[PDB]
Design a protein around this ligand. Structure first.
Ligand code: CHL
Ligand code: CLA
Ligand code: CLA
Ligand code: CLA
Ligand code: CLA
Ligand code: CLA
Ligand code: CLA
Ligand code: CLA
Ligand code: CLA
Ligand SMILES: CC1=C(C/C=C(\C)CCC[C@H](C)CCC[C@H](C)CCCC(C)C)C(=O)c2ccccc2C1=O
Ligand code: SF4
Lengths: 43, 64, 742, 221, 208
């Protein structure tokens, strides 16, 4: 629906979608690449 | 409930007392000369049962 | 008379209004010229009395909103029962509940937070919960994890049902106003039908399921060996082997030979010494009697038939001599206003939450609750806080009634007018007794502090220097200890063991609620509690009464319930609004409940809780340092705050480390709140306009104009961050303190 | 018209138009003032008739394995009461030709077709006959009323040749149906207190009515 | 794309939605949630149905035919579920990349065909080649339609396209049925069929 997508694009719904996606990204990075203090690639 | 005993006689007397208080001088439509509905007799018999259990399971604790 | 008046398809189910935010209000359903708009979109979201003027749509909105709340609570209970089923040690906690920490939450190993999954016990790594769900489940005879998963699925089902119910009762077939206004039937049903039949059905569970299962669980039986609950329903021989009165069935019941039911419907008051909780045999009889009582109470109000009290006929019957017409009109200001009812129900539900807190520590109703000191402390504290909040909201909604729904022309009341007439007398005597109590409860602490600092401990108000013994409370205590006897025969013991003549319920190594001795410190702190309650009532009652008019603002109702001020005139008239009065009463409720739960924690850890060795020598958690240190503020700072905050701050690298983390964080959020309570909007608007210049310099000027928070919004943010921070500080401190030394 | 326990509120809308009415609406669920959703006089009469027909089928089928199961016509294993057949495996499960749950899915599918078509004749009665359903959609029209289709698949041989006859037949229908509903309630409560079949509950009464009643059997199981 | 106001619908007696006029090849009015209420959303979901259908038909074939011509028409196929564990002449991540590079080409042409209705019809290498497809989702070219059956009357074309997606819908259902079967049940789909045909009662989803 056009109005359902208009609501999904609203600032809080899109903010929680964006930050859930982002948080999953950083979470899976800190699980696959945990305990990181220094960038060792071309160090 | 083993009719003829003290509990049963007391209960019937209390129920009939409350029904009598209802029919004559109160305290399911026109089917009695005094306007005594099925709900009215239900109420009067239920409160009769209340007072009957109270006086019966109690004449039990102290006395009878 | 009463009916099912309900109209179909009033509102269309469509996302069209989701797409248009702020549709509910006129000024909000045109666009965000400013940023305050979004704060007004959430602020007025559930202010249905301001959206519409007719009570029918408001009643439908709040009815379906209650359905959403019940969906939420069913989903929450689904989560709790599920997490118990899958992520818990409940199946192991039943074996050794006096030594295994009840845990129902496990964290994910990602960033080192897997330290939170600690050695709760039971071969299980998780978080030691303090909710008491495990204690309920032992009281519900669960003895499994399958039953918990099934309960979670059924609760999810009921959540979806309530969601569908809200949708149906707003959009598909919404009741009209004649349906809600029939409060006679509503009370007849909620008394008899919700509370009567609910307590009856729980008595059925308690008799058939909890009692026989706990008869084995307490008798050293492993949960895997216990017969399932339905086996008591299918096979009555197994149920009768412990309670032979079931072999006779309901013939003892219907023949009124109840004397042969005492095997499972008891009056032996006190705590089950095998587990520390109340006798489930007594709780079954309890809920049964409550069923009888609410069932006869829900046949009180006339609904359709000639019998029953019309509540108008009760209220109009009470008309005082010099109190005027009396209670006439109240049926019309309670049935034509949701805010009045909301205030009344909030006040009573909150004081009831507090009474729950008070009766759940002194008569532990669940097995292994009194020995789970974390659960006991957390539950008391929780319900106390909920009660304070509900009372403060009752004030807010009384004020909202007085501003909006109060109409002396149409919906007149006499007693409310009489209260408004001499409101200055009420508030003057309350403002006096608050000062009197403040002095003679806290200045006593100051006196003790000074006398102890001047080296004059013979001049304090202590149990050693100057006796301020609670003579009245001591008399009630001693006569409730000696109550089993002439006054209350057939009880076999006291109804509680929080009285001096009682005894100690040793459960395992723990002590579980021996008597509580009342000394001078209890006098002082109880008058501190009366003081804080009286000041909260001062603030809140003052806001309610002067919500409409004062000598300062005689047209305050036209300004609204929720307004900041009426300018710097009159010397300044900030916070004349009832909203601001309840915003202050929030802080005073916080101080009140904080000192209350401090009194609870310290009096319990010093005079009640502890550990009793097999020789009988009970050693308390602190060492009985309440009556000597709780007479001066330096003891609360030293022996309670400083000392008992040696397990929340030393919990770094432990399983209790999120507690110290939220200790510091809630500290922070409280202090952060002080940025809002202390400051004002104008500074922040000027700063925002400066950084908006910095943005417009870079073509980053947002169209939703950045506005500093409204004044009332700054006050709301301040009070909520302040309360959240103080309360999470206290929550972390209590939970870490009481889980560590346990 | 006869008025057996008829409230003054009730007979305002119970004007004799329904089949087998006696004014008995003491509560007032059939009050037409508002009453959307499922609570409405039309749907309520329809549900009366449908629960009555299904209760007739029940009261015949819940005891046919006993009124002629003890008479010898039916085998012994296929003669269990209503509550030991398999509807309550906690009480007993007979091993039919299939699993107890695939038969439930059979019920769901078959009666789903039937009952959803019934619903779509309830909402708009002009349908069930505008859509092709394997050619047999001609008699599924539901001519004039939802509770009384009268088609050649539901009324093959005519009985409503006169509205007098149809009215009397509908009255007999709803009366037998209410009687069967009360019967089913009796079945459930009797198997709940006695845990034995209804025909055996009849025979224990017929043998010695004094010590076999609700009074003496107030003790359960 | 001619409307049919009295077509047979998914749920007879119901009123099909306004956005399903009957024009599409196989629109029985089944859209309760309204996921195609918009015109462009409908145009996208149509091609989504078409390609899910065609991929699912190829999938159902490559599952059941290797499972039918293995249990009775004796051959040697490992499975359909554990075929991703088997080894071939290429590394598992390599040929995944190769089929991605090769399928993404065609799917980008499809993306172009959906966004712009006629844009990708000329072969970029040999512009004399062409796809004579006016309808989105139905490219009437030699590599796709060499036998000339994808043309003709719009009514025959509509009945043929609803035949297509009719086979494809139960192909989708069959493939996810094989998925849920190989998960709930241990053995393969045709073995599940034979176990059902042995005892239709005590062979179903139920095991307790
Ligand atoms: C794609 C989804 C689709 C769905 C969800 C339905 C759903 C339904 N159709 Mg339906 N149809 C669908 C596609 C189609 N139908 C029809 C033509 C019909 C007719 C003619 C009828 C239905 C009926 C039904 C209903 C009863 C079936 C049942 O009880 O399930 C039970 C099955 C299980 C629990 C699984 C066991 C196997 C139900 C609402 C019947 C109905 O109720 O009419 C009102 C009916 O008469 N459908 C056509 C051709 C036009 C379709 C084409 O795709
Ligand atoms: C602002 C102060 C601050 C700072 C500087 C850090 C810094 C850090 N914290 Mg701490 N932390 C803070 C506040 C802070 N934290 C607060 C307030 C909390 C409480 C909420 C925490 C709680 C916390 C925990 C509990 C943990 C950390 C961890 C970390 C480390 C994260 C490393 C990581 O996973 O990133 C890796 C990088 C990313 C996640 C970003 C990826 C970005 C994507 C891939 C886009 C980039 C690619 C892009 C396409 C461009 C490429 C180039 C080309 C294409 C152009 C890092 C040392 C973790 C750690 O290992 O500690 C040492 C850890 O366990 N922090
Ligand atoms: C008039 C005759 C009579 C007598 C001698 C008793 C005697 C007794 N009643 Mg009963 N009772 C009666 C009528 C009577 N009752 C009636 C009419 C009612 C109203 C239903 C009750 C309701 C009632 C309750 C609710 C309770 C008693 C209790 C008692 C006992 C203590 C006395 C008391 O009320 O305190 C005693 C055995 C109490 C008791 O000890 O119960 C065990 C108690 O809780 N009675
Ligand atoms: C006489 C029947 C009966 C019995 C055996 C109980 C039993 C119980 N009640 Mg309940 N209660 C009852 C009737 C009863 N209740 C009624 C009628 C009321 C309404 C006033 C209450 C109101 C009530 C409250 C408010 C509380 C209890 C609590 C308790 C428990 C405290 C321990 C004890 O010895 O209780 C002894 C019980 C009494 C002395 C109350 C008798 C009240 C008389 C009959 C009313 C006249 C126990 C499970 C407490 C609890 O559950 O805490 C966890 C608690 O806080 N009861
Ligand atoms: C510790 C901080 C503190 C203190 C001492 C007070 C003190 C007071 N508040 Mg305030 N208040 C505070 C914080 C505090 N408040 C905060 C943070 C808020 C934010 C919400 C409020 C909000 C607030 C409201 C909204 C209300 C009060 C009220 C009161 C009064 C109740 C007690 C009283 O008069 O009894 C006696 C005085 C005390 C207990 C204070 C301690 C004084 C000691 C005992 C003795 C002092 C020494 C003695 C006189 C010798 C003088 C020596 C000479 C050299 C000067 C009093 C003026 C209420 C009021 O005015 O009505 C009663 C009221 O309605 N306060
Ligand atoms: C706060 C709870 C609440 C309240 C006050 C109402 C009130 C109302 N509903 Mg709503 N409803 C609710 C919850 C509620 N409902 C929920 C949770 C659902 C989803 C399951 C529905 C679904 C629903 C529908 C679909 C309809 C109503 C209707 C009605 C109206 C008449 C109902 C009536 O007369 O009873 C009639 C009650 C019966 C005939 C008994 C029903 C028998 C069920 C199977 C058992 C009920 C007992 C209950 C489950 C407790 C036992 C628990 C069990 C485990 C033992 C009235 C406005 C009707 C109406 O007029 O539209 C507004 C209507 O059509 N409601
Ligand atoms: C409607 C309805 C329904 C759902 C049932 C359902 C059932 N009947 Mg009953 N029955 C009904 C009406 C119904 N009956 C009527 C109207 C009569 C007459 C009977 C006479 C009858 C007999 C005589 C027997 C059943 C049996 C059965 C069972 C097996 C069904 C089967 O395999 O075919 C099942 C519980 C059989 C059983 O209990 O096993 C069996 O022996 N039914
Ligand atoms: C539909 C009509 C109907 C008929 C013909 C019967 C007939 C019978 N019932 Mg059943 N019964 C019915 C309805 C009916 N009942 C309903 C609706 C209930 C639920 C309230 C019960 C609950 C019930 C129980 C619990 C018991 C019987 C028993 C009996 C038998 C002895 C009579 C007796 O105790 O009456 C009792 C009947 C009533 C109190 C209700 C009669 C009036 C209804 C509304 C008709 C007899 C075969 C007893 C038996 O077999 O032994 C027995 O234990 N019945
Ligand atoms: C790949 C999925 C898919 C998609 C995208 C479509 C898309 C479409 N279908 Mg088709 N359809 C499909 C599968 C699909 N269909 C299957 C498998 C069936 C048989 C069950 C049907 C039966 C069907 C009929 C009968 C009709 C359509 C119609 C339509 C159109 C309008 C409805 C709509 O907006 O759908 C959008 C659909 C989606 C966006 C997919 C839904 C996604 C959610 C997440 C599904 C979750 C629940 C689901 C039940 C779980 C799947 C479990 C599975 C193993 C059973 C649109 C072109 C109508 C039309 O105009 O025909 C041309 C019409 O009349 N479809
Ligand atoms: C700080 C302060 C402000 C200013 C507070 C501001 C307006 C809050 C700061 C902006 C909030 C955080 C909104 C910005 C976040 C938006 C949702 C935008 C999202 C951007 C990313 C974070 C996603 C007041 O207006 C005020 C008024 C009266 C008494 C005291 C005070 C007071 O103390
Ligand atoms: S300081 Fe703020 S609240 Fe007080 S009068 Fe001025 S604007 Fe109003």
């Amino acid at each position: 629906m056009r109005d359902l997508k208009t609501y999904l694009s609203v600032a809080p719904v899109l903010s929680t979608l964006w930050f859930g996606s982002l948080a999953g990204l950083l979470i899976e990075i800190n699980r696959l690449f945990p305990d990181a203090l220094t960038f060792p690639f071309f160090s | 409930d083993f009719i003829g005993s003290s509990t049963n006689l007391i209960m019937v007397t209390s129920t009939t007392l409350m029904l009598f208080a209802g029919r004559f001088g109160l305290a399911l439509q026109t089917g009695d000369p005094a306007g005594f509905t099925l709900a009215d007799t239900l109420a009067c018999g239920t409160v009769g049962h209340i007072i009957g259990v109270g006086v019966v399971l109690g004449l039990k604790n102290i006395g009878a | 008379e009463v009916k099912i008046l309900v109209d179909r398809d009033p509102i269309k189910t469509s996302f069209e209004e989701w797409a248009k935010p702020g549709h509910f209000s006129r000024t909000i359903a045109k666009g965000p010229d400013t940023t305050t708009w979004i704060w007004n979109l959430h602020a007025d979201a559930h202010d249905f009395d301001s959206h519409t003027s007719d009570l029918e749509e408001i009643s439908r909105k709040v009815f379906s909103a209650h359905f959403g709340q019940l969906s939420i609570i069913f989903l929450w209970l689904s989560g709790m029962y599920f997490h118990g089923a899958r992520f818990s040690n409940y199946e192991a906690w039943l074996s050794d509940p006096t030594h295994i920490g009840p845990s129902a939450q496990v964290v994910w190993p990602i960033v080192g937070q897997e330290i939170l999954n600690g050695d709760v016990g039971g071969g299980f790594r998780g978080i030691q919960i303090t909710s008491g769900f495990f204690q309920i489940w032992r009281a519900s005879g669960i003895t499994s994890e399958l039953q918990l998963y099934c309960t979670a699925i059924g609760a999810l089902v009921f959540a979806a049902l309530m969601l569908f119910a809200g949708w149906f009762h707003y959009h598909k077939a919404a009741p009209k106003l004649a349906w809600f206004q029939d409060v006679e039937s509503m009370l007849n049903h909620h008394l008899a039908g919700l509370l009567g039949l609910g307590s009856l059905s729980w008595a059925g569970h308690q008799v058939h399921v909890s009692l026989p299962i706990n008869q084995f669980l307490n008798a050293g039986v492993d949960p895997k060996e216990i017969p399932l609950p339905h086996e008591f329903i299918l096979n009555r021989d197994l149920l009768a082997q412990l309670y032979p009165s079931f072999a006779e069935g309901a013939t003892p019941f219907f023949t009124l030979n109840w004397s042969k039911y005492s095997e499972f419907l008891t009056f032996r008051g006190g705590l089950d010494p095998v587990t520390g909780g109340l006798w489930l045999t007594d709780i079954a009889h309890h809920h049964l009697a409550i069923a009888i009582l609410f069932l006869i109470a829900g046949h009180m109000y006339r609904t359709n038939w000639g019998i029953g009290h019309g509540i108008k006929d009760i209220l109009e019957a009470h008309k005082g001599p010099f109190t005027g017409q009396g209670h006439k009109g109240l049926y019309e200001i309670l049935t034509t206003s949701w805010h009045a009812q909301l205030s009344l129900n909030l006040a009573m539900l909150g004081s009831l939450t507090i009474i729950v807190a008070h009766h759940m520590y002194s008569m532990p109703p669940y097995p292994y609750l009194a020995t789970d000191y974390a659960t006991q402390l957390s539950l008391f504290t929780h319900h106390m806080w909920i009660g304070g909040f509900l009372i403060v909201g009752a004030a807010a909604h009384a004020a909202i009634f007085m501003v909006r729904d109060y109409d002396p022309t149409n919906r007149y009341n006499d007693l409310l007018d009489r209260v408004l007439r001499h409101r200055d007398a009420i508030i003057s005597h309350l403002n006096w007794v608050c000062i009197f109590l403040g002095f003679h409860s806290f200045g006593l602490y100051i006196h003790n502090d000074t006398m102890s600092a001047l080296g004059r401990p013979q001049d304090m108000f202590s149990d050693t220097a100057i006796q301020l013994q609670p003579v009245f409370a001591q008399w009630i205590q001693n006569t409730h200890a000696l109550a089993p006897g002439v006054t209350a025969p057939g009880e076999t013991a006291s109804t509680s063991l929080t009285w001096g003549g009682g005894e100690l319920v040793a459960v395992g190594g723990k002590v579980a609620l021996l008597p509580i001795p009342l000394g001078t410190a209890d006098f002082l702190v109880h008058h501190i509690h009366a003081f804080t309650i009286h000041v909260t009532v001062l603030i809140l009652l003052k806001g309610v009464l002067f919500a409409r008019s004062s000598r300062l603002i005689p047209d305050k109702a036209n300004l609204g319930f929720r307004f900041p001020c009426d300018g710097p005139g009159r010397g300044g008239t900030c916070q004349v609004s009832a909203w601001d009065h309840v915003f202050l009463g929030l802080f005073w409720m916080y101080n009140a409940i904080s000192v209350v739960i401090f009194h609870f924690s310290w009096k319990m850890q010093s005079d009640v809780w502890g550990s009793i060795s097999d020789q009988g020598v009970v050693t308390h958690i602190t060492g009985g340092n309440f009556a000597q240190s709780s007479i001066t503020i330096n003891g609360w700072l030293r022996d309670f705050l400083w000392a008992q905050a040696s397990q929340v701050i030393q919990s770094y690298g432990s399983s209790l480390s999120a507690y110290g983390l939220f200790f510091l964080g809630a500290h922070f959020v409280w202090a952060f709140s002080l940025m809002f309570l202390f400051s004002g909007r104008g500074y922040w608007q000027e700063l925002i306009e400066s950084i908006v210049w910095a943005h417009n310099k870079l073509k980053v000027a947002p169209a939703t104009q950045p506005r500093a928070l409204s004044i009332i919004q700054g006050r709301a943010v301040g009070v909520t961050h302040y309360l959240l921070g103080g309360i999470a500080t206290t929550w972390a401190f209590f939970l870490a303190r009481i889980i560590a030394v346990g | 018209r006869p008025l057996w326990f008829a409230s003054s509120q009730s007979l305002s809308y119970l004007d004799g138009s329904l089949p087998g009415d006696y004014g008995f609406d003491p509560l007032g669920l059939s009050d037409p003032e508002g009453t959307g959703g499922f609570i409405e006089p039309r749907w309520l009469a329809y549900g009366e008739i449908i629960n009555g027909r299904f209760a007739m089928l029940g009261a015949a089928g819940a005891i046919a394995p006993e009124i002629l199961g003890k008479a010898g016509l039916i085998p012994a294993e296929t003669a269990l009461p209503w509550f030991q057949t398999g509807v309550i495996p906690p009480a007993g499960t007979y091993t039919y030709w299939a699993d107890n749950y695939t038969l439930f899915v059979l019920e769901m599918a078959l009666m789903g077709f039937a009952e959803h078509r019934r619903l779509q004749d309830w909402y708009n009665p002009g349908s069930m006959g505008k859509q092709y359903f394997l050619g047999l959609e001609k008699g599924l029209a539901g001519s004039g009323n939802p509770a009384y289709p009268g088609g050649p698949f539901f009324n093959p041989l005519g009985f409503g040749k006169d509205e007098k006859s149809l009215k009397e037949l509908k009255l007999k229908e709803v009366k037998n149906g209410r009687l069967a509903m009360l019967a089913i309630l009796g079945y459930f409560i009797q198997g709940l207190v006695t845990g034995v079949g209804p025909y055996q509950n009849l025979l224990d009464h017929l043998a010695d009515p004094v010590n076999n009643n609700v009074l003496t059997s107030l003790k359960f199981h | 794309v001619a409307a049919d106001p009295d077509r047979p619908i998914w749920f007879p007696g119901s009123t099909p939605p306004e956005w399903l006029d009957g024009s599409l090849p196989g629109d029985f009015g089944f859209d309760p949630l309204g996921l195609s209420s918009d015109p462009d959303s409908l145009k996208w979901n149509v091609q989504a149905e078409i390609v899910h259908c065609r991929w699912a038909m190829l999938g159902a074939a490559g599952i059941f035919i290797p499972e039918f011509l293995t249990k009775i028409g004796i051959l040697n196929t490992p499975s359909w579920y554990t075929a991703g564990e088997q080894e071939y002449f290429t590394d598992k991540t390599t040929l995944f990349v190769v089929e991605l590079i090769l399928i993404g080409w065609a799917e980008g042409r499809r993306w172009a065909d959906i966004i712009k209705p006629g844009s990708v019809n000329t072969d970029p290498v040999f512009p004399n080649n062409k796809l004579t497809g006016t309808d989105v989702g139905y490219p009437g070219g030699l590599w796709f339609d060499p036998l000339g059956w994808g043309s003709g009357s719009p009514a025959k074309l509509k009945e043929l396209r609803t035949k297509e997606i009719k086979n494809g819908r139960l192909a989708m259902l069959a493939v996810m049925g094989a998925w849920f079967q190989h998960i709930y049940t241990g053995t393969g789909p045709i073995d599940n069929l034979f176990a059902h045909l042995a005892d239709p009662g005590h062979a179903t989803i139920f095991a307790a």
